């Protein structure tokens, strides 16, 4: 009974992060010890003529990015654990997230390490027009 959501290549990393006091640190450490990044994300097919904004209602990848389903790029959603937000809600679930193509092999790791500019809506260091 039920429907599988996961593949065996992700069992170890998701188990490790599901039990960690600090899941983001555990994921970073798992990668540094040679582990594979989380796979089975929701990658979208799009026209690559989007705005390039980081978090959007529909896919908005420009030619330097890929678009993903937002929950699938969130470590807390993938491990079914608490979000470190004040009210415990997610800012990626229910949106699409644009990830630089050079980082698209590890979308979960990308969202953990990076920040969206509140002024221009683009990732800091990967599109932000403010600095």
């Amino acid at each position: 009974a039920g429907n599988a959501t996961e593949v065996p290549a992700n069992s170890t990393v998701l188990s490790f992060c599901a039990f960690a006091v600090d899941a983001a640190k555990a994921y970073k450490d798992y990668l540094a010890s040679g582990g594979q990044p989380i796979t089975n994300c929701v990658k979208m097919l799009c026209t690559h003529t989007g705005t390039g904004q980081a978090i959007t209602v529909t896919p908005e990848a420009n030619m330097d990015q890929e678009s993903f389903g937002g929950a699938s790029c969130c470590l807390y959603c993938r491990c079914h654990i608490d979000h470190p937000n004040p009210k415990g809600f997610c800012d990626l679930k229910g949106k699409y997230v644009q990830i630089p193509t050079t980082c698209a092999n590890d979308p979960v790791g990308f969202t953990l390490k990076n920040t969206v500019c509140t002024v221009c809506g683009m990732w800091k260091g990967y599109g932000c027009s403010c600095d």
Binding site: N3, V7, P8, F19, C41, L45, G69, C77, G94
Partner: protein
């Protein structure tokens, strides 16, 4: 190739919208094309779902620098026999809004303690994962009849985990710097540990040089067994599955080969007492 870890146990026939699905497998078939997913204009997100996610199938076989192994060898377990706590969990089944997973109901320990939890699961919603009470029933059969009254005598998990930390601390503070849970067929015991165990690098207590055995979500601090009053999580426990030592039949038959003072009273604490007792006779007698 799929795993049962994080299986969706809801009875909803369809999958999720691409923005809400945790994984490509979980996206509804309608969005899948050309090896990936597409957004379909006019097909909205679902804003009211509650999908129970199974915690059966954890695999603690990582090797990460600075994080200790949870499962230990027979040789390491023998050196830490004073840390041994037998542990067994009897579960109840998800029902009604979900089917296909086991929830912890009676948590038993070799100290003779049984703790009863409210049937609680991890329910994915449009905004987060809601750790909440779920519909459940004991498994059918005369061997599981004793679990029927326990369905309405459970305590909330925030209370149960404090009681587990207090019991372990009182039992072990003068015996060991750690705990070794002694298990028989560990899968469901490891799923139950998700509800009261946290892991990370080896740490020291917030009041001494002893290694940390407990963690508090109230202050994000660490404590040994002597300084853990009010702490809610067991931190970096160790464990061993005795069934993997070459036994063939059930727990009771192997336990009874060495011991006769522990009669089977069919309860989690009894199974936990038998598992520790069997391990003690196997490693230390004759």
């Amino acid at each position: 190739n799929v795993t049962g870890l994080f299986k969706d146990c809801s009875k909803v026939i369809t999958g999720l919208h691409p923005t809400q699905a945790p994984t490509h497998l979980s996206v509804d078939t309608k969005f899948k094309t050309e090896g990936l997913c597409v957004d379909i204009p006019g097909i909205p997100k679902d804003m009211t779902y509650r999908r129970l996610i199974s915690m059966m199938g954890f695999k603690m076989n990582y090797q990460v620098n600075g994080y200790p192994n949870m499962f230990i060898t027979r040789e390491e377990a023998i050196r830490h026999v004073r840390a041994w706590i037998g542990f067994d969990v009897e579960g109840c089944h998800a029902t009604r809004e979900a089917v296909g997973t086991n929830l912890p109901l009676q948590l038993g320990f070799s100290t003779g303690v049984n703790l009863v939890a409210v049937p609680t699961g991890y329910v994915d919603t449009p905004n987060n994962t809601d750790f909440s009470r779920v519909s459940a029933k004991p498994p059918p059969g005369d061997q599981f009849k004793h679990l029927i009254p326990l369905m309405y005598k459970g305590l909330p998990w925030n209370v149960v985990r404090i009681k587990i930390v207090q019991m372990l601390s009182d039992t072990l503070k003068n015996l060991s710097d750690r705990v070794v849970f002694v298990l028989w067929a560990h899968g469901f015991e490891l799923t139950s540990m998700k509800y009261f165990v946290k892991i990370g690098p080896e740490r020291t207590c917030c009041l001494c040089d002893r290694r940390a055995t407990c963690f508090s979500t109230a202050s994000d601090t660490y404590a040994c067994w002597h300084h853990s009053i009010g702490f809610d999580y067991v931190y970096n426990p160790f464990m061993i599955d005795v069934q993997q030592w070459g036994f063939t039949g059930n727990l009771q038959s192997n336990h009874d080969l060495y011991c006769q003072v522990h009669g089977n009273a069919h309860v989690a604490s009894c199974d936990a007492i038998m598992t520790r007792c069997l391990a003690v006779h196997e490693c230390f007698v004759k």
